[PDB]
């Protein structure tokens, strides 16, 4: 959701991202880059992620010929599935209305009562 919590929780400052919004109103990263030449693989960004988007995976073979190629953009980080946390969906809990999920349709949410309604 491009909330920038992983970027600030990073002690090396090797995560850069920008928030963008679609037409329905959901937040997403416009870009997302991790400088893996700086990253110490400490797992603080995964610990700080409130959506379980960023994850540290069992893969150690990341050697490169050029240091510029260790800067991983969003196309090199976004995988096809949920990774280590299979069922969590932040937008099923958040209060913002997005496509397919209106007001009062999140977890533990009542339908919105208009102030003009006849009931006291």
């Amino acid at each position: 959701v491009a909330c920038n919590l992983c970027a600030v929780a990073c002690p090396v400052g090797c995560i850069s991202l920008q928030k963008a919004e679609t037409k329905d109103g959901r937040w997403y990263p416009e870009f997302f880059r991790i400088n893996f030449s700086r990253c110490i693989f400490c797992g603080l960004c995964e610990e700080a992620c409130p959506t379980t988007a960023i994850q540290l995976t069992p893969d150690f073979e990341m050697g490169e010929y050029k240091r510029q190629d260790l800067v991983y953009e969003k196309e090199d980080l976004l995988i096809s599935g949920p990774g280590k946390y299979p069922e969590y969906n932040f937008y099923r809990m958040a209060g913002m209305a997005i496509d397919g999920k209106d007001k009062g349709e999140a977890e533990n949410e009542a339908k919105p009562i208009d102030v003009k309604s006849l009931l006291p």
Binding site: V115, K116, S117, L118, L119, P120
Partner: protein, 156 residues
């Protein structure tokens, strides 16, 4: 589009004559509009605002604050059944069940023809004769579930 009638404006101004501040006639102005038109439409807030010289946000806050100022379209008759403690002791739940069976609605909404609308209301001040129910201008006491069809048939 909402135009105030001449009689409504005259009654509103006569109510403004009773107070030293024109804002004090907002509740009675909303009640006058509701009595004339069944409820208070969206343009009525702006019309009362221009008549009284107070902002429309104030009139909207007053209209949405009070329960008896209707800001949604209702039916031609309003059932107001008392859900308070003494009528609960005297069994208002059977009266509510009979009303839900006859009208075939839930409380708060209107019938398909707009003939009745059902509302749980506050204590009517008739607790010694409970349970009580308020139709548009008439209070009814000593209610029984069997008397609901014979009581509701006199309101068309």
């Amino acid at each position: 589009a909402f135009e105030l009638s001449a009689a409504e404006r005259e009654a509103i101004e006569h109510e403004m004559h009773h107070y030293e501040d024109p804002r004090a006639a907002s509740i009675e102005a909303l009640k006058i509009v509701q009595k004339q038109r069944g409820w208070v439409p969206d343009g009525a807030i702006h019309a009362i605002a221009d008549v009284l010289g107070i902002p429309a946000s104030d009139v909207e806050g007053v209209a949405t604050f009070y329960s008896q100022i209707f800001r949604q379209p209702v039916g031609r008759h309003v059932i107001r059944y008392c859900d308070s403690v003494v009528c609960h002791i005297n069994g208002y739940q059977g009266i509510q069940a009979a009303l839900e069976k006859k009208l075939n609605i839930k409380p708060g909404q209107t019938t398909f023809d707009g003939r009745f609308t059902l509302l749980p209301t506050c204590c009517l001040g008739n607790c010694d004769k409970g349970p009580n129910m308020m139709i548009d201008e008439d209070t009814h006491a000593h209610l029984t579930p069997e008397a609901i069809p014979e009581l509701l048939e006199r309101y068309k």
